[PDB]
């Protein structure tokens, strides 16, 4: 996904990344599911498809057994989505949690 | 358990009042005096001053909690 980000075309990965998220959701692999959801949300944010990301977050369940960094990224993306959708309390809580869960020596 | 006991006592009094009203038991004036004294002793918890005192002490306890 980073390679395609530098390519400047993430919509091309959209299909494959999303189908592989479906595969990783059918096969219970929390790390893969979480990372794929985070990358999809990043792509949606980059193309400003906040409504698409809103449905994806609403109808997708993030794995609770994900590492602190995937949790931080997912919480940041969800918080931005909520802020745009005018859910400010949810934005605050998710974003504060993202800041707290992000690594404190880098990033 | 205390709520259950209070309910039991109230049910006993209610049954006695049923019996007296229907006619099985004669009017007992001492008992009626006691009952109306109790019902008058029942407090009011919407006086706008008892409410303020209750909230003040509730907060004074929740701070310690």
């Amino acid at each position: 996904a980073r390679v395609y980000e530098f390519l400047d075309k993430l919509d091309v990965v959209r299909s494959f990344l999303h189908a592989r998220l479906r595969t990783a959701t059918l096969r219970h692999d929390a790390d893969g599911q979480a990372t794929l959801l985070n990358l999809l949300l990043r792509n949606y944010l980059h193309y400003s498809l906040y409504d698409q990301a809103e449905k994806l977050v609403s109808k997708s369940v993030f794995p609770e057994q994900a590492n602190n960094n995937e949790w931080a990224r997912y919480l940041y993306y969800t918080g931005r989505i909520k802020a745009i959708q005018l859910e400010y309390s949810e934005a605050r809580r998710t974003m504060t949690n993202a800041l707290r869960k992000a690594p404190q020596h880098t990033a | 358990h205390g709520l259950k006991g209070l309910n039991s006592k109230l049910l006993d009094i209610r049954s006695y009042l049923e019996k007296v009203a229907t006619g099985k038991l004669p009017i007992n004036h001492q008992i009626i005096y006691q009952l109306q004294d109790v019902f008058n002793l029942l407090p009011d918890v919407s006086l706008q001053e008892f409410v303020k005192a209750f909230y003040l002490k509730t907060n004074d306890q929740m701070v310690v909690v």
């Binding site: 479906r22 409504d51 109808k59 | -």
Partner: protein, 191 residues
Amino acid sequence: MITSAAGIISLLDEDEPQLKEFALHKLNAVVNDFWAEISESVDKIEVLYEDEGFRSRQFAALVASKVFYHLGAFEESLNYALGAGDLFNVNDNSEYVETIIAKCIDHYTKQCVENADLPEGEKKPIDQRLEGIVNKMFQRCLDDHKYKQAIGIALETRRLDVFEKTILESNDVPGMLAYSLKLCMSLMQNK
């Protein structure tokens, strides 16, 4: 690339069955990425499916089943996959169809065990198309020599006839019978 299914979903209700068919074909095309929008707008494709006048019932059922699959319900998804009749392909060896048949056989096994436990009068009249799909998959297992797996599903589903058929048409009757007896003694709990 396509950034929203809103236009196609709007086409799904136009009063013109031709427009509805075109939009529903495009929905089948793009569901793998936009199941969330069709997820939000399932109700209209639902009523489209229940409307028997519209002559694309099986295809609409397939599309709605794909959507519910992507949601993860796996119950309405299975219902609409079966409602698709014969349109859905079992030999297209895709993850969608593989998981749909997995959920189908799980549901069939659960209903069959409940039915066997119940009395001999009335069970929960079983869907003959469910039975047909499970029998198709039985036939696939018989063709591809996986007699162990066939016997396993037969015991799971309480399909005594299918178990007998597979052991009879097996390539080693003594070995299959030994497998059957050993597993039956080791695991079968229901008297």
